[PDB]
């Protein structure tokens, strides 16, 4: 919106524009800015939904990043989560207990009741036998009104191969059909959006 | 290998005699998600089923499993503090009057009865941890501590402060810097997060103890990637996977 | 792993024990027959 | 012919020091080959 | 039922463009750590 | 001009002069007495708002607070369950300019010597945490507008 | 008898007497003049010990500290970096009885019928975690024994 | 005051019997910043909760919480 409203067919132009905006507004430093970019995405595989992608820091130190990145991310997360209107979506790797998740842990500080905290599972391609996510869904670890939603994402090798989103969707559908005999319907992009709306 | 277990036993006996529980002797604390296989791991280490599983967990008191290897040279050390026992496998409890129990089911029933008697109507915790000693030739010398998990299932109702009591007990057990925290998790919860990891991060900024144990790796499905399960390139731990 | 951890923490355990002993001695200092005889004689 | 807080603190400190020293001595007595 | 979300999004975008983030309206915020799968699901 | 004069002090403790408090009070009064000088009182949120010494000294000579502006810094340590939204609205002490609460860096941020932009971001975060509606008023922009006016 | 004295009414707002601060100061001085009142100083761990007025007022009558005890609270909510290890050792606050820290109990713990033993164990665990070699110098039982002494 | 339960009663009884002046018990006077957890610490030392605590203001006025026991001239309750 802040630009001339030109439509970028290729996302490479979008990435270049975002990089230029970050370099200009924030100068040399790559820190956060008080003017979040306004992005509009129109796709037939999604429905009316709003999401915010906060800055991410690599677990293994790679490349060059600003020294104050951690504190900036912490303050941005604190500002975003504390808003009662906006629900907290915590991205937790694997089906681990979202209660121990760092994002949910910090959110509990401002949301002790946990009436507006949501945890979404990522990287379900590693799903195996044993203690599945059934306990998490049932709330045995801790009762959560919003529950937990399972989402399948690309593996490390697939990500390194720059696999297309359509290939990832096909792989997710195949895994759900083969792995989950009855819980496959609980996943899906459209089903995920419907569950988020619910 | 045959020295650490007697050392731990002597330290525990001294602590019980003096009646002081300010700090805990070095040991391995077993913590993890509810029904994450901790009971299964303990039974496998023992070699027989002697602990509750599924929707039947009733022994919420801390159980200390001290496996002792049986050998000809170890007979004197094992019988140094007790009387000569010719049975290949036997068990005893420190708090008891040197009573000897062999059957695993009988031991489980006795432990459950003692826990119910001590805890009474309330299912909280008491400053008298259950001590278990096993002398079998099929178990190597090793010490483990078993504590209840997030047993929110309605298996008889629990006090509202049950979670607080469990957290306090775990924190007290891990308070010793020489005690390792064993993070037992299923295949799904390899290393991303866990109660053990959370408590380790809370007690110390980093924590010089991180071991991950994966259970139920036989009923899996072929064609599923497991590179992170073994290599653990996402959150590698100091003690390995 | 337990043996390795114990060996690694042995110097740390010794250091913390020494620190505890020093603190206990210091606080005890901050907080007999000859003295009693002298007091009786003075009285 | 004829002639609590501090005491508790001293007793606790002495007991803790004795226990720590005993544990350290017992650990040291363990065989070197069994501490790898 | 479906036209409310676009209106809220437009209002939030306009307010952010004005330079004030004080306004709070219903939305969803994704919080996570890099390499945890957040980027993959967002893509 | 920006000046950070020494604040009011209680009875001297340690090696401080016995009559240092009187000298400090006289020096402060020699400057804040003139109406031109602006008394920007700053009180930490770690203590009760009624126990602030800056407010006490302001009342000593400026009971009406015509030229006195209340600032609450270090709000990150403010006790939970208590809110000062009513005070900021002028219900108890109405003022045309209005009360603006600037939030100082946190203890960890203070130790790390964080930047001013990070301080502003933390201030906005805390204001949204407590009272989003008054966040704009408490923001540094309103303080700049008041200074310009 | 348990009495909690607020740290004076610096800012009289509302129907409070104009001389409320003077009356409170006189009452505190009368109470501390005789040894019949135990001067237990409680200060927040996050806040600087020297800045706290409790120690300053306590040391006026009993600088030695024989009948005065220093207590540090808000240990659980204490921020990183502001370690109180020096304070506990007395290098900055020489006390003839030592500095004893206590972990505050929230409303949830009380509502959950938490026992005193659980609170003591939690305090000891927190002291061990934060202080590797000062766990036994801040126990609740030690504080009770010091109060009895 | 866990171990002071019988000692104080014995002192009060002997003072009453001897006919000497009944000196009031030493009131615990604590000063400092508000919301510092003074009430929580006092309750922990006593072992029971009888004063305001928790987040926010924990003290608002010097309260003479005089615990009077019969014959000194769970069941905790107030009275005015």
Swiss-Prot record, chain B:
Q: Which UniProt keywords apply?
A: Acetylation, Biological rhythms, Coated pit, Cytoplasm, Cytoplasmic vesicle, Disease variant, Endocytosis, Glycoprotein, Golgi apparatus, GTP-binding, Hydrolase, Isopeptide bond, Lipid-binding, Membrane, Mitochondrion, Mitochondrion outer membrane, Necrosis, Nucleotide-binding, Peroxisome, Phosphoprotein, S-nitrosylation, Synapse, Ubl conjugation
Q: Which residues are noted in the entry as GTP-binding? A: 32-40, 215-221
Region annotated G1 motif, chain positions:
32-39
Question: In UniProt terms, what is the effect of altering residue 41 to F?
Answer: Temperature-sensitive. Impairs mitochondrial division
- Region (G3 motif) residue spans: 146-149
A molecular function (GO) held by this record is: GTPase activity
GO CC annotation terms, alphabetical: brush border; clathrin-coated pit; cytoplasm; cytosol; endoplasmic reticulum; endoplasmic reticulum membrane; Golgi apparatus; intracellular membrane-bounded organelle
Cysteine disulfide links: none
Sites where N-acetylmethionine occurs are at 1
Impact reported for residue 39 to N: Reduces peroxisomal abundance
Q: What is the effect of changing residue 59 to A?
A: Abolishes GTP hydrolysis. Impairs mitochondrial division. Reduces peroxisomal abundance
The free-text domain remark for this protein reads:
The GED domain folds back to interact, in cis, with the GTP-binding domain and middle domain, and interacts, in trans, with the GED domains of other DNM1L molecules, and is thus critical for activating GTPase activity and for DNM1L dimerization.
What name does UniProt use for this protein?
Answer: Dynamin-1-like protein
| Species whose genome carries this gene | Homo sapiens
Q: Which gene encodes it?
A: DNM1L
State the covered range within the intact protein. Answer: 1 to 241 of 736
UniProtKB/Swiss-Prot annotation, chain D:
Task: Please give the tissue specificity annotation from the record for this chain.
Answer: Ubiquitously expressed with highest levels found in skeletal muscles, heart, kidney and brain. Isoform 1 is brain-specific. Isoform 2 and isoform 3 are predominantly expressed in testis and skeletal muscles respectively. Isoform 4 is weakly expressed in brain, heart and kidney. Isoform 5 is dominantly expressed in liver, heart and kidney. Isoform 6 is expressed in neurons.
- The protein depicted here goes by the name Dynamin-1-like protein
- Disorder noted: May be associated with Alzheimer disease through amyloid-beta-induced increased S-nitrosylation of DNM1L, which triggers, directly or indirectly, excessive mitochondrial fission, synaptic loss and neuronal damage. Encephalopathy due to defective mitochondrial and peroxisomal fission 1: A rare autosomal dominant systemic disorder resulting in lack of neurologic development and death in infancy. After birth, infants present in the first week of life with poor feeding and neurologic impairment, including hypotonia, little spontaneous movement, no tendon reflexes, no response to light stimulation, and poor visual fixation.
- What exactly does this protein do? Functions in mitochondrial and peroxisomal division. Mediates membrane fission through oligomerization into membrane-associated tubular structures that wrap around the scission site to constrict and sever the mitochondrial membrane through a GTP hydrolysis-dependent mechanism. The specific recruitment at scission sites is mediated by membrane receptors like MFF, MIEF1 and MIEF2 for mitochondrial membranes.
**Domain of life of the native organism:** Eukaryota
The text of the family note is: Belongs to the TRAFAC class dynamin-like GTPase superfamily. Dynamin/Fzo/YdjA family.
Domain remark in the UniProt entry: The GED domain folds back to interact, in cis, with the GTP-binding domain and middle domain, and interacts, in trans, with the GED domains of other DNM1L molecules, and is thus critical for activating GTPase activity and for DNM1L dimerization.
Task: Print the organism lineage.
Answer: Eukaryota, Metazoa, Chordata, Craniata, Vertebrata
Record's subunit section: Homotetramer; dimerizes through the N-terminal GTP-middle region of one molecule binding to the GED domain of another DNM1L molecule. Oligomerizes in a GTP-dependent manner to form membrane-associated tubules with a spiral pattern. Interacts with GSK3B and MARCHF5. Interacts (via the GTPase and B domains) with UBE2I; the interaction promotes sumoylation of DNM1L, mainly in its B domain. Interacts with PPP3CA; the interaction dephosphorylates DNM1L and regulates its transition to mitochondria.
Compartment(s) of residence:
Cytoplasm, Cytosol; Golgi apparatus; Endomembrane system; Mitochondrion outer membrane
């Amino acid at each position: 919106l802040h630009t001339k409203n030109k439509l970028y067919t290729d996302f490479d132009e979008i990435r270049q524009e975002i990089e230029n905006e970050t370099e200009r507004i924030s100068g040399n430093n790559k820190g956060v800015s008080p003017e979040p970019i306004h992005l509009k995405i129109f796709s037939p595989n999604v429905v009316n939904l709003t999401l915010v992608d906060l800055p991410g820091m690599t677990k293994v130190p790679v490349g060059d990043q600003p020294k104050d990145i951690e504190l900036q991310i912490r303050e941005l997360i604190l500002r975003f989560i504390s808003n009662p209107n906006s629900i907290i979506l915590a991205v937790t790797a694997a089906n681990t207990d979202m209660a121990t998740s760092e994002a949910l842990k910090i959110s509990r500080e401002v949301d002790p009741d946990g009436r507006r905290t949501l945890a979404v599972i990522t990287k379900l391609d590693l799903m195996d036998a044993g203690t599945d996510a059934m306990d998490v869904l049932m709330g045995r670890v801790i009762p959560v009104k919003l529950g937990i939603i399972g989402v399948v994402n690309r593996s490390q090798l697939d990500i390194n191969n720059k696999k297309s989103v359509t290939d990832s969707i096909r792989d997710e559908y195949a895994f759900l059909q083969k792995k989950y005999p009855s819980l496959a319907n609980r996943n899906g992009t459209k089903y995920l959006a419907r569950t988020l709306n619910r | 290998m045959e020295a650490l277990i007697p050392v731990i036993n002597k330290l525990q006996d001294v602590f019980n005699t003096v009646g002081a529980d300010i700090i805990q002797l070095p040991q391995i604390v077993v913590v993890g998600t509810q029904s994450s296989g901790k009971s299964s791991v303990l039974e496998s280490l023992v070699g027989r089923d002697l602990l509750p599983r599924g929707t039947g967990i009733v022994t919420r008191r801390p159980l200390i499993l001290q496996l002792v290897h049986v050998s000809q040279e170890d007979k004197r050390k094992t019988t140094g503090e007790e009387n000569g026992v010719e049975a290949e496998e036997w068990g005893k409890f420190l708090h008891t009057k040197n009573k000897l129990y062999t059957d695993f089911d009988e031991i489980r029933q006795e432990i459950e009865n003692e826990t119910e008697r001590i805890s009474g109507n309330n299912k909280g915790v008491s400053p008298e941890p259950i001590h278990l000693k096993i002398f079998s030739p099929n178990v190597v010398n090793l010490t483990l501590v078993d504590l209840p998990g997030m047993t929110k299932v309605p298996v008889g109702d629990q006090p509202k402060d049950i979670e607080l009591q469990i957290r306090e007990l775990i924190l007290r057990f891990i308070s010793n810097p020489n005690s390792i925290i064993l993070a037992v998790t299923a295949a799904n919860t390899d290393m991303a997060t866990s109660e053990a990891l959370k408590i380790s991060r809370e007690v110390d900024p980093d924590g010089r103890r991180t071991l991950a144990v994966i259970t139920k790796l036989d009923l899996m499905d072929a064609g599923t990637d497991a590179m992170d399960v073994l290599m653990g390139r996402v959150i590698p731990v100091k003690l390995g996977i | 792993l337990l043996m390795h951890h114990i060996r690694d923490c042995l110097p740390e355990l010794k250091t913390r024990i020494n620190v505890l002993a020093a603190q206990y001695q210091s606080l005890l200092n901050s907080y007999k027959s000859a003295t009693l005889l002298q007091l009786i004689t003075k009285f | 012919g004829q002639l609590e807080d501090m005491a508790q603190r001293r007793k606790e400190a002495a007991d803790m020091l004795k226990a720590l020293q005993g544990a350290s001595q017992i650990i040291a007595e363990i065989r070197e080959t069994h501490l790898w």
